[PDB]
From a paper:
WbdD is a soluble protein that controls the length of some lipopolysaccharide O-antigen polysaccharides that are synthesized in an ABC-transporter-dependent pathway. WbdD from Escherichia coli O9a contains two enzymatic domains: a methyltransferase (MTase) domain and a kinase domain.
We therefore designed, cloned and expressed a new construct, WbdD556 (residues 1–556), that was purified in the same way as WbdD600. This crystal grew from the ammonium sulfate-based condition, but was harvested more than six months after the plate had been set up. During the intervening time, approximately half of the volume of the reservoir solution had evaporated, leaving a much higher (∼2 M) concentration of ammonium sulfate. Data from a serendipitously found single native crystal that diffracted to 3.0 Å resolution were non-isomorphous with a lower (3.5 Å) resolution selenomethionine data set. Here, a strategy for improving poor (3.5 Å resolution) initial phases by density modification and cross-crystal averaging with an additional 4.2 Å resolution data set to build a crude model of WbdD is desribed. The resulting map was used to build a complete model of WbdD. The best diffracting crystals (which also belonged to space group I23) had a unit-cell parameter of 158 Å, which is again considerably shorter than the 167 Å unit-cell parameter of the native crystal that was used to solve the initial structure.
Author numbering: 4 to 377, 381 to 398, 416 to 473
The structure:
């Protein structure tokens, strides 16, 4: 009998599924977490086009497991307490149509034994802190990595050090330390535990999918830096995910260890905001990539775009790949000239901001640096020369002749329309080497070093 099994529970942690007579006795009501978990289940189930296989780690009295089984899920629940599992099985029997299995077992062992594809979704609510306490942070990070590796998605409610209990002292400084090694993560809620005033964050984590309420898709690889050789400029607060026809930029506004300034957060916020603005409203006759999704919240913001073919110029340069400098410069200058005519300029023309397709046509890929108003744009023309030089001191005829021509122009005349015009006629232009010159060359060379 259920009554006896319930009585022999060391603790009625959760609501007893289907038995409201014990609702008052339950430490946690579970309705709030359930509402959120069911929402995420639905999202993922919709995306994959079917009911899910779900793994419930430290399943206690089976509330979440049974609740999901109720909606059609196939579930396996694990708990290391025999009493808990006995209740779960009993409840399952009262609901014979539910596809629900329960096993007495250790989370550590089950995770080690998992195979990829076995489960779509794993839930681990207020359990991993126990594992941290006995086995340390590094082992837990590995467990969670593997869990992520073998599933599509993972939901965790994580206990925190601020909680007033003795075990809090073993906890990481920040719960994100347990998951940040995983590819994708988002805060999805915060819950009152009724143990104390300190709430527990609930995180949605994945090593295989971008999981955004509006956009739920696999990705094939991701990176923590914008390009090969970026170093640590953004202090790792930015992540990039690449899928079949999309790129997802995910910016953290909030980082652990307080590492993001105020200024840096705001710049993350500003760049993303700025990028969305431009892409949603681009100028006529400018092939700009398309916006598939976007959003912001307190912790972070994101943008999903159409993917554009090709390789990043800076990589190609570094990896000594063969390039057509004429086609690259021509295509790029053409786009800059056209932007300018529409009263747009790009503040940051660099190799890491240029993408080159298989036909050696080049385009800009970072629209964070796009601007509308300012003498000007004389500075931008100047940097473009550096760009040119780095793309190759280094300029053969007629590129040198081109630059020399521009340098002979009064500064009021300098803009991208001019730069392009002269570029197009560069073979006709006088020879730089035949003139005193010689300074245009030395200035940029120093600039380009600088
Ligand atoms: C505090 S409760 C949380 C219960 C449930 N996940 C929830 O939040 O509603 C922790 C549960 O995990 C179980 N547990 C703790 N450590 C475990 C481990 N290493 N392996 C399996 N179960 C564990 C306990 O028996 C208990 O049922
Ligand atoms: N539309 C896109 N298609 C393909 N790759 C992209 C696209 N947008 C960005 N990237 C990639 O993102 C990386 C950094 O993107 P970027 O636009 O520089 O973001 P940020 O500079 O704000 O970090 C680039 O190295 C590039 O590989
Ligand atoms: Cl936890």
């Amino acid at each position: 009998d259920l009554n006896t099994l319930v009585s022999e529970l060391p603790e009625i942690y959760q609501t007893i599924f289907g038995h409201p007579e014990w609702d008052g006795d339950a430490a946690r009501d579970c309705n709030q977490r359930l509402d959120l978990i069911t929402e995420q289940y639905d999202n993922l189930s919709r995306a994959l086009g079917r009911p899910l296989n779900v793994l419930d780690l430290g399943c206690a009295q089976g509330f979440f497991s049974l609740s999901l089984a109720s909606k059609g899920a196939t579930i396996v629940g694990i708990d290391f307490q025999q009493e808990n599992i006995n209740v779960c099985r009993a409840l399952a029997e009262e609901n014979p149509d539910f596809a629900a299995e329960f096993r007495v077992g250790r989370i550590e062992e089950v995770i080690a034994a998992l195979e990829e594809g076995e489960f779509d979704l794993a839930i681990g609510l207020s359990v991993f802190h126990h594992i941290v306490h006995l086995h340390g942070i590094d082992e837990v990070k590995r467990l969670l990595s593997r869990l992520a590796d073998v599933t599509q998605a993972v939901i965790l409610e994580l206990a925190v050090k601020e909680e007033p209990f003795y075990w809090g002292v073993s906890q990481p400084d920040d719960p994100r330390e347990l998951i940040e090694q995983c590819a994708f993560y988002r805060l999805i809620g915060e819950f009152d535990t009724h143990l104390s005033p300190v709430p527990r964050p609930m995180y949605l984590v994945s090593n295989h999918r971008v999981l955004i309420n509006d956009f739920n898709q696999p990705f094939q690889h991701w990176q923590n830096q914008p390009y090969a050789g970026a170093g640590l400029a953004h202090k790792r607060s930015r992540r990039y995910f690449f899928g079949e026809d999309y790129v997802c930029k995910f910016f953290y506004y909030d980082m652990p260890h307080g590492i993001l300034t105020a200024e840096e957060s705001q710049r993350n916020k500003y760049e993303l905001h700025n990028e969305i603005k431009f892409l949603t409203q681009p100028p006529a006759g400018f092939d700009a990539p398309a916006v598939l999704a976007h959003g912001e919240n307190a912790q972070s913001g994101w943008l999903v775009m159409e993917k554009l073919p090709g390789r990043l110029l800076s990589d190609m340069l570094a990896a000594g790949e063969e390039i057509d400098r004429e086609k690259i410069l021509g295509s790029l200058l053409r786009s800059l000239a056209a932007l300018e005519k529409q009263g747009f300029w790009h503040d940051d023309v660099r190799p890491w901001n240029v993408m080159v397709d298989a036909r050696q046509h080049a385009r800009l890929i970072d629209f964070g640096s796009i601007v509308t108003t300012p003498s000007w744009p004389t500075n931008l023309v100047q940097s473009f020369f550096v760009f040119v030089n780095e793309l190759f001191f280094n300029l053969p005829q007629p590129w040198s002749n081109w630059l020399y021509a521009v340098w002979q122009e009064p500064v009021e005349r300098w803009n991208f329309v001019l730069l392009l015009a002269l570029f197009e006629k560069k073979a006709k232009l006088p020879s730089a080497e035949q003139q005193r010159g010689a300074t245009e060359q030395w200035i940029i060379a120093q600039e380009t070093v600088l």
